[PDB]
Design a protein around this ligand. Structure first.
Ligand SMILES: C[C@@H]1CCN(C(=O)N2CC[C@@H](S(=O)(=O)c3ccccc3)C2)C[C@@H]1N(C)c1ncnc2[nH]ccc12
Length: 277
């Protein structure tokens, strides 16, 4: 299993930077002749470290067609780097925004289903993702996506069905906003927002922050109040009613009335099969 000399990990370009960390595109190049393979490298910037070492083990334990591949780690005596496969097509968020004129609903629902299957899988390990958004989805090719970040992922406790813990508040279930509770259910609410993002094709004027801030008129509080009076993101221009209905069932205030991911992949596969024509 793959073992990495820090010394031969050559920085090529910056892929994402945050509050406490970053993702780089590096080439691992032991033969020093630039024929090494390109990888993605996650590092911390300024217990985070405990959380980072859990993340590594989570990603490692995942092996799935729609989850980004763990490659190994890279350390200094005694500046931890998590190594993953590099997917050159980049995030679905940017890829959708780019090729909207070549990506019909059939494609949209393919990605949607591959996202559910990945999430279904996470659930089999009681993993809660916590950050479901097009931002964190990668495109392997035109017909395949992978969930590409597990920064916030948690393992549920063995006797419980929720984990209590800047947050992307416009993607969050209300119980996440008010009780900091995270669950399969809250992953489902967020999935609904992913479905919303996909069918707006990332039109900046139609993003969850823009529409929610519009409907609002502490931002967080305003959001809680809005969600509680059944305010919701509108149906995207051109969205079929069955896709919007899946969204509104994901955004049910009651955790227990939200659909399962196995059910979501199913309905979504049947709606995609009914458009094939
Ligand atoms: C879309 C991907 C997931 C998201 N990622 C990103 O920008 N983030 C993940 C971590 C955070 S962070 O590092 O900014 C951060 C760290 C700590 C606290 C807070 C923030 C942002 C970009 C990735 N990307 C473009 C890639 N492109 C090609 N192949 C890839 N393989 C693996 C990733 C990847």
């Amino acid at each position: 299993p793959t073992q990495f000399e820090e010394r031969h990990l050559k920085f090529l370009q910056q892929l994402g930077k945050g509050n406490f960390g970053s993702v780089e595109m590096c080439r691992y190049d032991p033969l020093q002749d630039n024929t090494g393979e390109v990888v993605a490298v996650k590092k911390l910037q300024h217990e985070h470290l405990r959380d980072f070492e859990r993340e590594i083990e989570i990603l490692k334990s995942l092996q799935h067609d729609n989850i980004v591949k763990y490659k190994g780690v890279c350390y200094s005596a005694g500046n931890l780097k998590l190594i993953m496969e590099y997917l050159p097509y980049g995030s679905l968020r940017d890829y959708l925004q780019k090729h909207k004129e070549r990506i019909d609903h059939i494609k949209l629902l393919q990605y949607t289903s591959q996202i559910c299957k990945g999430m279904e899988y996470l659930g089999t390990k009681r993993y809660i993702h916590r950050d479901l958004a097009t931002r964190n989805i990668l495109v392997e090719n035109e017909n395949r996506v992978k969930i590409g970040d597990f920064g916030l992922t948690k393992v549920l406790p063995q006797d419980k069905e929720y984990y209590k813990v800047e947050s992307p508040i416009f993607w969050y279930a209300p119980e996440s906003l008010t009780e900091s509770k995270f669950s399969v259910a809250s992953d489902v609410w967020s999935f609904g927002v992913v479905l919303y993002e996909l069918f707006t094709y990332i039109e900046k004027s139609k993003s969850p922050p823009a529409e929610f801030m519009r409907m609002i008129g502490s931002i967080v509080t305003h959001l809680i109040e809005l969600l509680k009076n059944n305010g919701r993101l509108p149906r995207p221009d051109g969205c079929p009613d069955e896709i919007y209905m899946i969204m509104t069932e994901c955004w049910n205030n009651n955790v227990n009335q939200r659909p399962s991911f196995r059910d979501l992949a199913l309905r979504v596969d049947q709606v995609r099969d009914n458009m094939a024509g």
